[PDB]
Symmetry: C3
Subunit: 332 residues, 3 copies
């Protein structure tokens, strides 16, 4: 059974095929690839673009999406095995996934980490459990990686540069400020796809404490050694931005401070200058800027940067619809 | 770009065309005016009729509605310009409207005032922001006016009297009781459409403090001088109801007490007799009664009045579906 | 006007026809029985299977389901007659049902008892009110009985035994543990359909305090005297399970302790051994086990029992989709 849990699990040929079908769907939006079929969109956290794009995608391909929110409308779910369910959870994922599998043709799941202990969050328990127990394909709508965002992002880049081959371009994945510590998911994904596409990647972040999990630093290393690109970690703003072709910002809490954010607060607060403004973007080679959204203006990026003709965030956002339809079509 | 923010922005010819198409859709409900198209229904407050009627309307015309609730499922939105987003809001309407505009063909928005300061609520910031930043038509699903309700109401009246020409009829817009101070939106809208239709309008309310915002009193004045009707403010029940052809009730907090409801509580509480009962309706010329709903029985109107054959509230409620389909068809 | 409030209200011929159409829909899922039609699914409590199955069912038959949650998105509703609505409820069911009746073709309603006073919960006020005021057919999505579950369950049994005639088989409806007192709805329904199908039924429960409401014990008595089966109440585990062909578990709070659960807590807590495990199921005649779900593993039933090839709960869950489509088709 083929799932869409991570682009890393797919071959470059399969990913290229997805992106191409995405471009094709962008040209002809209505189709019958999902006629009479349905997808259950399970959300354990908030969403605007993901819920909307998947729901419309199913509709445009002749299918139907059922939106579920455990703890809100659906019953809370237990994932640990062999435990006595006398707590807050009403049913086990074993039953949930099997039941849904009798109703729908695809299952999407969004579940952010709990931020109490990275040792447990990094195991990707919710996603793996759905994939384990579901008799139908499972799609990652963001857990500790955000693969649908990776493809929307990659397509937007290929569209901007007018070619599927991004090798050569200097890609800068920069950390940015936010009053709260966030998920590293989008950053892990950006690092993964940027290297898989063979670009010259630079992970710009405040201090070594903000370096991503080894799992992704290693995926990136293997991707580079096979794509022809390169990976580099930096803590100097100006040097990183210089000559860049692409700048992708994202904020995230330092992994070493999981379950202990009290001391990390003052640390991030002294790096508010990592905000993407005109000054930094001027150091790039007429490079493009993007963010996965939602974005806090004048915090993560300035109004000027967001309204700049070089900001392709809205195009990347649109592409979420096209890439997802390609993913659903490929899995059914 | 044409939007449906207020009937006042539309010409009488355009409004007559909408009402006619509404009547046509009421005769033939299934159509293809929205085939493959979609509308994002953004709700910042509760709704039963609006969400249901729009959702079914999109379905019946071959399209699909995506229901969103910022703060509930979708991310909270910021509307103020050039501010530092380090508060409760995650993204700016600038991005929200542009992203949705890449997904859907129409955007509906419902956003009640905050009731903290009428000076800010009356600016209609949420609605204006969507219309400003959206690349697709925007529809007012109720903010400080309720135009979809105006047309459902007008159509119901034309159906009751068997003619589109309502000139001559005596229309009474009466305030009614409610334990809490409410939005003036429906009252502002009733005053607007009743005069636009050229009826003899009387705004019956407890005291001068309950008179509506000058903006709408002025719209009404201009509507009368062009429709042939008339406007009048009254504080005497019996005289107002006498010979009336239509009685539309609605409760609302006195504008002069915005952000300071403590002292207004005892004021409204001494006017519970403004409730629409058999006695008052008997003073009318076999007139009809209606309310936008939801209605608190034995508080706003008595059970007898609600179950009276002269109460057309259910018909007006149904018309919300037909008028809205006419609006969506006209905007696409 | 025909509604689907309880299987008891339907003749055996009509129920047999529903089950047959259910089997037919299971063979050919896409149809046009609800083309252009819609159903309003009103939920006053949580749901995963019910919301999903009804929503997909409407879609597969060419219709559309509108999901509503009073108090969450829709306005709170009042059901008592002739009262002054100055409390938490915004509108009366009289208006709600009539308005929905102008929009949709069917109305489903789920409303659990309040658990404050069985004397009032047993009156089934919400369901009866919808059926009273709605101009369109009403469907019970679970209140104090769960008829859609009854048919999904019955069909699963007929499929397992390879015949619609279940007479002769020994059916055991056993109470099970749960940290909290639950609704008796599913148990009342199981007792009702098991006897209506003419099986040898045994209601196994801890003490006489856990016996179901007389209303259902009486329905069962009348069903037996007409179906040829038999009814029996038991408090001895091993004797009940011995030679059973079917074992259906469900937990519920003792009716005599409604509104006074404090003292019942220690009572249920001393019967945790009523859990359905391998030991008990081994006493059966290679019998099948099922539960309506959601189920707490290692509390209501053990992991071994749930993963046993004799557990048909997933099949019963799937059947909810098929039986419901048969119900909607029959009512339109
Ligand atoms: C697109 C994912 C956004 C989510 N953002 C927040 C602010 O929680 C995150 O950081 O993963
Ligand atoms: C149809 C709009 C109803 C809303 N009512 C309440 C009670 O908030 C209002 O007064 O504007
Ligand atoms: C299928 C109905 C399940 C509901 N369960 C809970 C746990 O509330 C009940 O006991 O009625």
């Amino acid at each position: 059974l083929k799932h869409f849990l991570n682009t890393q699990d797919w071959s470059r040929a399969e990913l290229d095929a997805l992106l191409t079908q995405a471009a094709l769907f962008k040209r002809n939006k209505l189709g019958s690839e999902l006629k009479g079929k349905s997808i259950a969109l399970v959300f354990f956290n908030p969403s605007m673009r993901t819920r909307t794009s998947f729901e419309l995608g199913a509709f445009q391909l002749g299918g139907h999406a059922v939106v579920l929110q455990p703890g809100k409308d659906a019953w809370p779910i237990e994932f640990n095995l062999g435990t006595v369910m006398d707590g807050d959870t009403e049913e086990h994922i074993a039953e949930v996934a099997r039941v849904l599998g009798r109703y729908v043709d695809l299952i999407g799941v969004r579940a952010f980490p709990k931020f109490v202990d990275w040792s447990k969050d990094r195991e990707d328990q919710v996603l793996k459990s759905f994939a384990k127990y579901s008799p139908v394909p499972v799609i990652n709508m963001e857990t500790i990686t955000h693969p649908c965002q990776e493809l929307a992002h990659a397509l937007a880049l290929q569209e901007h540069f007018g070619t599927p081959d991004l090798r050569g371009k200097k890609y800068v994945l920069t950390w940015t400020y936010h009053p709260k510590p966030l998920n590293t998911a989008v950053a892990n994904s950006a690092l993964t796809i940027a290297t898989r596409m063979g670009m010259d990647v630079t992970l710009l972040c405040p201090t070594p404490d903000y370096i991503l999990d080894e799992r992704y630093m290693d995926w990136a290393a293997q991707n580079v050694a096979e794509s022809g690109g390169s990976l580099q970690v930096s803590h100097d703003i100006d040097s990183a931005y210089a000559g860049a072709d692409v700048v992708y910002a994202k904020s995230w809490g330092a992994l070493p401070f999981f379950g202990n954010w009290e001391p990390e607060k003052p640390i991030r607060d002294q790096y508010q200058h990592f905000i993407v403004d005109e000054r930094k973007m001027a150091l790039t080679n007429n490079g493009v800027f993007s963010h996965c959204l939602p974005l806090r203006r004048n915090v993560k990026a300035t109004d000027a940067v967001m309204d700049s003709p070089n900001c392709i965030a809205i195009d990347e956002a649109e592409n979420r619809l096209h890439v997802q339809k390609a993913i659903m079509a490929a899995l059914v």
